[model samples]
Target chain A: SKNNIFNKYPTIIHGEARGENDEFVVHTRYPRFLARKSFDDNFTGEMPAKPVNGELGQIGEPRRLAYDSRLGLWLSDFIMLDNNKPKNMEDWLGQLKAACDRIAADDLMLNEDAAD
Target chain B: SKNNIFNKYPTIIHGEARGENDEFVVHTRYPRFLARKSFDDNFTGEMPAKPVNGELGQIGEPRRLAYDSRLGLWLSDFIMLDNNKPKNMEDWLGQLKAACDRIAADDLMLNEDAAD
Candidate 1:
């Protein structure tokens, strides 16, 4: 159903209106927001902690900022392959993150420290 | 093996250099210049007439300036599908031009004069 996947992920769909009926129609956004959010969520390996009892939990800044260029390209291509959202974005994101980690492990693509 | 198609269409190939030897390598440009030129050639439906007796021929200006949006979108998509130059871009260009002409015939997408 059109409502199923899109409803769950509001960021993927955009509404365009046409004609006198003034009805809204759906359009897909390329490099969808959710997929980008998923990549950010998975890659950083951390999220800002939620507040507890009206007080915020301590969470430091992310380990790194911005995706590796090659990895970023792969993620965008994967999302463009299909209109429907992947059944398990978290798992898919995890797998891709692991792949990036593996590549970094071999030193083929590593982030240089700002000092260097 | 690689030289066959690209040699015929010089506009499609670009040269890049890597390493100390400065050996040049070929890279494909997106929306290839030749494809864009072919679209312009086929869509315009007329070429400037060759001059006779060392004087210019009165060919006049092009019928239209730019491609219709839908037609332009199709041309770019067709080029991106394969790396090698298309076997017969003239025929392919002719066919796409006909498709655009057909759409215009039905008034589904027609150009309006600046005065309108």
Candidate 2:
């Protein structure tokens, strides 16, 4: 009983594509479907400054980008944790897998980033 | 290189517990940690009535509830899809697993429900 909010097909988003406005267009096959940054460079073990409201913010943190299929909009970007904070890759992956599995067993889906 | 935003410990939350305010006190070991509705009853194959802003809304659709660790608050509840719309559980689970794996590879965390 999984939620079908996400497109099943491996639709493409702006991996290396750009739109007319010079913005990275993450277009996908489904008109309402979207591509999002499941995570960003902040997880690459380097703390870089991020642009938040035209100002600089800390980096090397956990970030997420989401989509709104109904409105065809981006949810807005946000952070989760600080840089180099996880104990190790193995631990994090294990926990993530466990979380996903639990979600599947419960037949649930995480909220869309677009929702308030 | 996964994000450390989520506490690795299987800390407990208000799953059959209540707080002084009679609220379902989802108390976990990590003071800054939280438990969220990864998905909700909307995916259960039956449409029910939901409360939205003191009004009745549709249900059996995909829904999400997120947390804001910074402020110790909930991001708010939101819907993802309509009821009985998903092709099947297998399809949705596959997509979700893929999404999680992709996030792990990228070393990113989806935004906290709390962050605006």
Candidate 3:
């Protein structure tokens, strides 16, 4: 958790293709979904950091951007291990699979880069 | 994986209090919920077993009690890590909190049991 500021944003993000708020937006059949990293660079494994304010499984609130003193800017209201069932599940999951694939490929490339 | 036959069912189940089917039933304000162990005794940590057929995030099916050949009987159709947003969350979460407490207490008692 120490590397919160210098975090490794490994999770893949999708949304923005044509033009929205000066950013390009995509006109697709699937609903928009964002991928947020729940871990820091020093996160070697599980047993995540404690929640910001609300306890896990009981974060009752609408989504909003939250800023942490140490972690800087974030969109998630609660810092808990979320077990979410997204409304746009079909599109979200497709992106999720792609994200996982990207993560694996990145790891492999990292390994090659560090191979001395 | 090898200890599939001899799995430790230790999550905590709640639904039948009195008796039904020769067991009496209780008048409750909350919905029925069952807690099935998603891990074996040898599951010393994270990285759960593979899914039965469907991959994680794409288990499109109604709930049903599934029976695995080697692992005996189970209710989970897909053997993937489910991120569920249960409808009866209030009662379910209350039970879940109690369950965690019980698990911790159980570990302490087990330590005493194996102390000799």
What is every candidate's C-alpha DockQ against the true complex, given to 2 decimals?
0.03, 0.03, 0.01
Among incorrect, acceptable, medium and high, the docking class of model 3 is incorrect
B105 Cα displacement, candidate 2 (Å): 38
Q: In candidate 1, what are the lDDT values of residues A60-104, reduced to their tens digit?
A: 363222224232221111222124456786665554454333322
How well does candidate 3 score on lDDT at residue A97?
A: 42
lDDT tens per residue, model 2, A16-49:
1111111122111222211122233232222223
List chain A TM-scores, every candidate, in order: 0.24, 0.23, 0.30
**Model 2 reaches what TM-score against the true structure?**
0.17
Q: Write the per-residue lDDT of candidate 1 for residues B1-116, one digit (tens) a residue.
A: 22232232222221111111111111122222211111222342221233111111122263322234232221111222123456786665554454333323222111222123
Off by over 4 Å in 2: A1-84, A108-116, B1-116
| Clash pairs (backbone) in predicted model 2 | A14-A26, A39-B108, A109-B38, A109-B39, B14-B26, B42-B60, B42-B61
* Deviating ranges (above 4 Å) for candidate 1: A1-29, A32-88, A91-116, B1-65, B68-85, B109-116
Rank ordering of all candidates by TM-score, starting from the highest: 1, 3, 2
TM-scores of the candidates are 0.20, 0.17, 0.19
